[PDB]
Enzyme design. Structure first.
Site, mmCIF file in Angstrom:
data_model
loop_
_atom_site.group_PDB
_atom_site.id
_atom_site.type_symbol
_atom_site.label_atom_id
_atom_site.label_comp_id
_atom_site.label_asym_id
_atom_site.label_seq_id
_atom_site.Cartn_x
_atom_site.Cartn_y
_atom_site.Cartn_z
ATOM 1 N N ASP A 103 2.994 43.231 34.073
ATOM 2 C CA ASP A 103 1.869 42.937 35.249
ATOM 3 C C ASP A 103 0.998 41.866 34.907
ATOM 4 O OD1 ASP A 103 0.788 44.606 33.526
ATOM 5 O OD2 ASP A 103 0.077 46.198 35.184
ATOM 6 N N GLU B 241 3.263 37.208 38.901
ATOM 7 C CA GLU B 241 2.032 38.274 39.138
ATOM 8 C C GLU B 241 1.041 38.189 38.268
ATOM 9 O OE1 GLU B 241 5.186 38.978 38.070
ATOM 10 O OE2 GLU B 241 5.416 40.518 36.606
ATOM 11 N N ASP B 242 -0.158 38.027 38.734
ATOM 12 C CA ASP B 242 -1.432 37.981 37.901
ATOM 13 C C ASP B 242 -1.289 36.737 37.005
ATOM 14 O OD1 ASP B 242 -2.561 40.184 39.027
ATOM 15 O OD2 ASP B 242 -1.699 41.673 37.368
ATOM 16 N N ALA B 243 -1.103 35.614 37.560
ATOM 17 C CA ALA B 243 -0.807 34.466 36.904
ATOM 18 C C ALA B 243 -1.345 33.336 37.654
ATOM 19 C CB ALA B 243 0.650 34.361 36.359
ATOM 20 N N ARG C 58 -3.697 44.902 46.614
ATOM 21 C CA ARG C 58 -4.910 45.198 46.364
ATOM 22 C C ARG C 58 -5.887 45.362 47.274
ATOM 23 N NH1 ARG C 58 -2.230 41.843 42.629
ATOM 24 N NH2 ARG C 58 -2.239 42.550 40.474
#
Ligand SMILES: [Mg+2]
Ligand SMILES: [Zn+2]
Ligand SMILES: [Zn+2]
Lengths: 365, 335, 68, 49, 338, 101, 49, 45
Positions: free
Chosen positions: A146, E24-26, E208
């Site tokens: 993640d 994701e998260d980049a 989120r």
């Protein structure tokens, strides 16, 4: 008191990064850690031509070597303090060099909270710029990645027999299923789903100024494609969006891939409760694939990627081996990353505001 | 396919240019150089010394995006490259202060320089026709005729604020007569590089070479090089009255017009429209207005950094995009 | 610390428009929007450079390691 | 032919470590238990683990 | 007084999917934006030594300035002055010395003091800089601390630029690593000509539910225009109704959706893309002090900086949780190898 | 004469002309899109498409696939001479408008 | 608090279900040849395939 | 060699080996070192 324990030579720990331009059986290794992590290679009849140049290039040039071990065990001769290119000229047939980590070398790759057996896979190496262990995102789901600044471990096997077991019964292409239920756990992911829903949407009609570019972006140039006759003709020659996924499963006549599954996708509407075919729905819904040709339905999470037993890559895996499923996963993973950046997809504050009727029904109900 | 495009409240259609032989049954729109010479033309709105605005009609998005893409990188310019420091006892670090000398624009023709060969040693790469040398030398001194009160660091301090005008060009090597007609200055000398206090001193020397904008941002010869498609407002169902004046107050004020002592509204000077589709959420104006933009028209707008005139950058970009096409057809294809 | 020479996004030189901005704030009293409008910058990019910027070098030069 | 080929390859191969596989197939779903109080009863009559 | 000492950068953000290195998260970054000073930082580290007065009336002296056959000085010594300390302004790469310390080799135990000549013996033991990238010497300071004992404190500063591996927050908990530094001729350009600084994946919002971040752009983009820094305080602040009124009469969209002309192909983008500025901030935890590797033997060759602080996440080990994973594969010859 | 600027990949080109592929070093999306548009305006070409396989390199793989009696090594030459003609048309119209005003 | 119990159940369950493998007579046994199950799952089918 | 600088009065002083490290003007106990007079190379990228 059952903690970690052992300390293992020839390992590294670096953060991870996104890269769908890489194959699913490969992890790109930077050239700063693929210079101290060596591999011992015995010289033989079939590597004397390469290992001489490999010793001559030295420890600082990357296709090189750091140490050397003689046949009669003189010492462990390092290639740094003297003993120049004349040392590569003798090269007795039992000598063991310690070459750098190069392209195509079997390497195993780990994440420290190891839950199950899909937490330690094995990859091929690829030597790159900036110092991070970047990898594909179809393979990050079994690691439970993640990304957000997480680190991962990397180990190289140091013998010829454990290197053969990492790539055969432990590698990525031979582990496309989780053993917990038999379902595919390592398949298409997040942005590869919404990049497939927008192509296979019914309001997508392409053209040779676009369709040719779509076929070229998925196979980075070199692949022979057979363009089918279009679904719309004499007014406007238009190709639908379901003829793109019909084409990346089976590009030409040389590939034997014939896929014949049919199953319902996510959120689904009954057609009329009287129409006996399940694919007369109000939405797109039920998916028909007959001979590597999508007849109906969008490519969402249920049909394409992680989930149940009725995936597309599961059918390619059971029918035509693991290599073809790996090729199709690579092809869609480098199609969607190029397409979705040039179509456009955003959320904003406009797509979350109620339009003054929900504010009436919420006050009422 | 289905010309001048539609602006919708949630999407936009007719994106692809699609004018090739094979869009339809009839093989329409081949290459035909004599047709492209007839269709294509250029208008010019204004020309300044550091700003140019002009228009191209009947031309693809691809080979007009190419001009915008290689105005930034492939057109070369000069900037400060190597900074040599002496006695930097100021508060600004010598990596920060060297990074700001690289980002000032220089006003000189980049045709008077040759590319650096990066295989020679450090005492042989820099020669007469290759390097422009600048020098900064400022020492701060307390002003003895101080005022009645401590007010600002501008007063009661000799040269506490350095500027870009204190970068003095030095005539280097042998050819000191080629730059005697046009000595190189910064494009805007009022650039506050550092602040000093008495006891501090900055003495340096900068070597300036030629480079492209794809290697680093400081060699980019243009500040803003962009375009916009010409918008268009097709207003049907021509109804008038109080709603026509509400139709005016949405838009910018000089893009549609109420007729003074006469009939209904119209569109005047649609060039000044910044499309925000603010008339597509009312339910009063639903089948009475049609926003769009013509795909073949381009409004090129270029504001340069100050090194050269912006009408030279477009001509040089067309020359560069030509020269990489004839370089490829004269190379053998090795199997 | 100091105003940057070029803006981050497009690259317009905004380092020469800080002392004139401070001169337009104190004397010839205007709000920051109009005084930043009749100074150059038109877009909201390159306007963010002069609007949201702290001047720490005036607070750093009070701790001079020189004579004082 | 397809049915007999898919049944013949489906048998458990000798030398498989299927005891170690069955231990990881149970403990790995165990590490994602949020609370989720349920009941084998009506209107909150019992609290079952 | 956080507005007097802020920690972060006001970027400009196009919330859209782009280039595929943002899954994701980049985040992706702009080249020719970090080249103009976006996200530059520096790291300053202290190295302190003390010169002990031993029991038998002797000291450990510093010294140097040794040369060998016209080398003035040698490669290991060309960061030191005539005193033996590193001078201000020089750079320090690998094993070059920046403090040349020498201790006496006979005064380890206590030979209670005699007047015999034994003080002409010094075993040198300096401190040696090591690291991936070089540093710079900016301060060195002498001290005479409490019991009349010499103290040397040197400071080493290092300039760093944002690269692949450096993580950024978003003032709402949207932390993420850097994915790729993208060229400036890419990144669609909103006809006025504002190239985005950091492009963010729009999938991080539904899982989120940070819609207040969506109010940061609307109250930010309409805050730049009429020169007023807005207020986003809790249970109040700027209302969303009268911040889209400031934004609509400047010629923009009320909801912040601008239409982008694409960068690599030049045509329009078929969806409207939410654009505007977001206050980003650069954290710790860079990749330059986390790349750690080991070949063979103790004192590993790629050593990270020793700042753990109750964060021992195993390290270069092979625990019993990882022993159980290779049993399920059945690889018996990898067990003996590892 | 440079022999590394453009190549021709081995296990991608078919026999006798048709369905060929090329590899160009030191190239970005600019000439790729500019060359994809000109070759697409040839009525003897089906499939003309470029791709950059990896962004931290300087490579461009283009593929040209034709109908018949036109080799793809000749449709590349025909689609590259016409770009020079386009650049000759563009800079001649732009010069006379600066000149005459 | 789940990170403290990230592997406590699966490691303890790994103690007994470790040295169980299928032999070449389609029987799964322990390490001391004590037979535990005559055919795997009652039919001898690989749940992966 | 110009080796010392006071941290309060900033007086350029230089003493030899083992000469009671302090200031001869004010008496401050810590001393800084001046920037060197050699040439240092940097890159403006
Ligand atoms: Mg995480
Ligand atoms: Zn700007
Ligand atoms: Zn003093």
């Amino acid at each position: 008191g059952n903690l970690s324990g052992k300390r293992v030579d020839f390992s590294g720990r670096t953060v991870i990064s996104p890269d769908p331009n890489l194959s699913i059986d490969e992890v790109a290794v930077p050239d700063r850690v693929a210079k101290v992590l060596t591999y011992p290679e015995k010289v033989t009849r079939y590597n004397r031509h390469k290992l001489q140049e490999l010793i001559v290039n030295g420890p600082n040039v990357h296709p090189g070597a750091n140490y050397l071990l003689k046949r009669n065990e003189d010492a462990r001769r390092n290639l740094r303090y003297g003993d120049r290119m004349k040392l590569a000229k003798n090269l007795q047939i039992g000598d063991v060099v310690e070459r750098h980590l190069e392209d195509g070398d079997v390497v195993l790759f780990n994440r420290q909270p190891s839950l199950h057996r899909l937490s330690i896979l094995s990859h091929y190496a690829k030597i790159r710029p900036w110092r991070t262990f970047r990898l594909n995102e179809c393979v990050c789901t079994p690691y439970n990645a993640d990304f957000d600044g997480d680190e991962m471990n990397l180990h190289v096997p140091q013998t010829e027999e454990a290197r053969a077991e990492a790539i055969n019964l432990m590698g990525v292409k031979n582990n496309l299923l989780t053993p917990k239920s038999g379902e595919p756990i390592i398949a298409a992911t997040q942005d590869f789903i919404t990049g497939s829903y927008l192509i296979s949407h019914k309001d997508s009609f392409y053209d040779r100024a676009t369709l040719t570019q779509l076929l070229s972006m998925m196979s980075d140039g070199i692949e022979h494609f057979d363009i089918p006759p279009p679904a719309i003709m004499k007014p406007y020659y238009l190709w639908t969006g379901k003829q793109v996924f019909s084409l990346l499963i089976k590009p030409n006549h040389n590939s034997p891939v014939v896929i014949n599954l049919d199953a319902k996708n996510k959120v689904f509407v009954p057609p009329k409760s009287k129409s006996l075919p399940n694919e007369m729905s109000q939405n797109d819904g039920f998916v028909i694939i007959r001979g590597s040709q999508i007849l109906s339905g969008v490519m969402d999470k249920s049909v394409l990627g992680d989930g149940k037993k009725h995936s597309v890559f599961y059918t390619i895996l059971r029918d035509y081996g693991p290599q073809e499923a790996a090729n199709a996963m690579n092809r869609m993973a480098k199609l969607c990353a190029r397409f979705l950046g040039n179509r456009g997809f955003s959320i904003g504050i406009n797509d979350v505001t109620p339009a003054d009727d929900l504010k009436q029904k919420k006050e009422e109900l | 396919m289905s010309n001048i495009v539609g602006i919708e409240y949630n999407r936009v259609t007719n994106t692809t240019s699609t004018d090739f032989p094979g869009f339809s049954k009839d093989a329409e729109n081949e290459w035909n150089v004599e047709k492209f010479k007839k269709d294509f033309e250029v208008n010019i709105s204004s020309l300044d010394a550091r700003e140019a605005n002009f228009d191209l009609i009947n031309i693809d998005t691809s080979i007009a995006n190419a001009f915008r893409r290689i105005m930034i990188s492939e057109v070369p310019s000069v900037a400060a490259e190597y900074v040599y420091f002496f006695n930097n006892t100021s508060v600004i670090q010598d990596e920060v202060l060297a990074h700001r000398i690289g980002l000032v624009p220089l006003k000189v023709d980049p045709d008077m320089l040759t590319w650096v060969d990066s295989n020679l040693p450090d005492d042989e790469k820099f020669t007469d026709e290759n390097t422009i040398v600048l020098s900064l030398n400022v020492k701060c001194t307390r002003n003895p005729d101080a005022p009645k009160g401590s007010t600002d660091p501008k007063e009661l301090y000799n040269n506490a604020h350095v500027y870009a005008r204190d970068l003095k060009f030095e005539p280097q090597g042998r050819q000191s007569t080629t730059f005697a007609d046009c000595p190189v200055v910064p494009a805007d000398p009022d650039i506050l590089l550092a602040k000093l206090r008495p006891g501090q001193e900055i003495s340096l020397k900068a070597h300036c070479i030629l480079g492209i904008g794809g290697d680093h941002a400081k060699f980019s010869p243009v500040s803003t090089a962009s375009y916009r498609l010409l918008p268009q407002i097709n207003i049907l169902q021509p109804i008038k009255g109080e709603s026509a004046r509400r139709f005016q107050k949405c838009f910018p004020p000089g893009v549609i017009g109420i007729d003074e002592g006469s009939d209904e509204a119209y569109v005047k000077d649609a060039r000044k429209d910044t499309v925000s589709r603010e008339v597509l959420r009312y339910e009063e104006f639903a089948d009475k207005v049609k926003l769009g933009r013509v795909r073949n028209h381009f409004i090129f707008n270029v504001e340069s950094a100050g090194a050269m005139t912006p009408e030279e950058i477009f001509f040089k970009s067309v020359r560069i995009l030509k020269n990489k096409a004839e370089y490829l057809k004269n190379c053998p294809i090795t199997q | 610390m100091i105003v940057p020479v070029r803006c981050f996004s497009c690259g317009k030189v905004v380092g020469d428009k800080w002392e004139s901005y401070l001169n337009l704030l104190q004397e010839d009293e205007l709000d920051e929007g109009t005084a930043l409008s009749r100074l150059g910058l038109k877009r909201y990019c390159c306007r963010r450079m002069i609007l949201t910027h702290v001047d720490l070098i005036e607070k750093f030069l009070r701790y001079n390691p020189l004579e004082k | 032919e397809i049915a007999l080929f898919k049944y013949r390859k489906a048998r458990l191969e000798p030398g498989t470590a299927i005891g170690a596989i069955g231990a990881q197939s149970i403990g790995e779903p165990g590490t994602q238990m949020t609370l989720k109080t349920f009941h084998f009863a009506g209107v909150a009559s019992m609290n079952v683990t | 007084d956080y507005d007097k000492l802020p920690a972060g950068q006001n970027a400009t953000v196009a919330v859209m999917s782009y280039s595929g290195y943002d899954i994701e998260d980049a985040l992706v970054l702009n080249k020719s934006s970090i080249d103009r000073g976006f996200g530059r930082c520096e790291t300053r580290r202290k190295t302190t030594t003390v010169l002990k007065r031993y029991a038998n009336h002797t000291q450990d002296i510093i010294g140097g300035m040794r040369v060998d056959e016209n080398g003035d000085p040698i490669w290991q010594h060309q960061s030191l002055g005539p005193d033996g300390l590193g001078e201000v302004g020089m750079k320090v790469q690998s094993g070059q010395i920046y403090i040349n310390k020498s201790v006496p080799t006979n005064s380890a135990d206590a030979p209670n003091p005699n007047n015999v000549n034994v003080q002409t013996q010094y075993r040198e033991a300096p401190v040696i800089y090591r690291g991936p990238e070089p540093s710079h010497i900016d301060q060195v300071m002498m001290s005479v601390s409490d019991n009349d004992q010499a103290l040397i404190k040197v400071l080493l500063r290092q300039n760093r630029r944002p690269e692949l591996g450096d993580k950024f927050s978003s003032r709402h908990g949207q932390k993420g690593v850097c994915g790729i530094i993208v060229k400036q001729e890419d990144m669609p350009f909103n006809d006025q000509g504002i190239v985005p600084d950091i492009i963010m994946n729009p999938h991080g919002f539904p899982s989120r539910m940070t819609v207040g971040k969506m109010i940061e752009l609307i109250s930010g983009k309409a805050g730049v225009l009429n020169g007023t820094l807005e207020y986003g305080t809790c249970f109040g602040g700027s209302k969303l109704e009268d911040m889209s009124k400031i934004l609509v009469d400047q010629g923009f969209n009320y909801s912040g959706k601008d239409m982008l002309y694409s960068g690599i192909t030049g045509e329009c983008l078929q969806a409207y893309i939410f654009f505007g500025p977001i206050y980003y901030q650069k954290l710790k935890h860079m990749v330059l002090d986390k790349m750690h590797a080991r070949a063979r033997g103790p004192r590993a060759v790629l050593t990270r900086q020793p700042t753990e602080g109750r964060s021992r996440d195993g390290g270069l080990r092979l625990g019993e949780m990882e022993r159980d994973c290779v049993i399920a594969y059945g690889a018996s010859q990898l067990l003996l190898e590892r | 004469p440079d022999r590394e600027k453009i190549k021709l990949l081995t296990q991608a080109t078919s026999e006798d002309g048709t369905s060929a592929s090329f590899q160009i070093v030191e190239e970005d999306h600019t000439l790729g899109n500019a060359l994809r548009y000109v070759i697409m305006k040839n009525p003897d070409v089906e499939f003309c498409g470029y791709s950059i396989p990896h962004p931290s390199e300087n490579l461009l793989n283009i593929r040209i696939q034709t109908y018949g009696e036109t080799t793809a090594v000749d449709a590349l030459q025909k689609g590259l001479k016409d770009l020079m003609d386009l650049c000759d048309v563009v800079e001649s119209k732009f010069t006379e408008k600066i000149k005459s005003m | 608090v789940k990170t403290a119990e990230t592997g406590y159940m699966s490691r303890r369950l790994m103690k007994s279900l470790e040295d169980l493998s299928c032999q070449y007579d389609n029987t799964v046994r322990t390490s001391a040849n004590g037979i535990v199950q005559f055919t795997y799952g009652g039919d001898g089918l690989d749940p992966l395939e | 060699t110009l080796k010392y600088i006071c941290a309060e009065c900033s007086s350029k002083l230089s003493l030899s080996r083992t000469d009671a490290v302090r200031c001869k003007d004010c008496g401050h106990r810590i001393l800084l070192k001046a920037r060197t007079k050699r040439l240092v190379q940097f890159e403006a990228r």
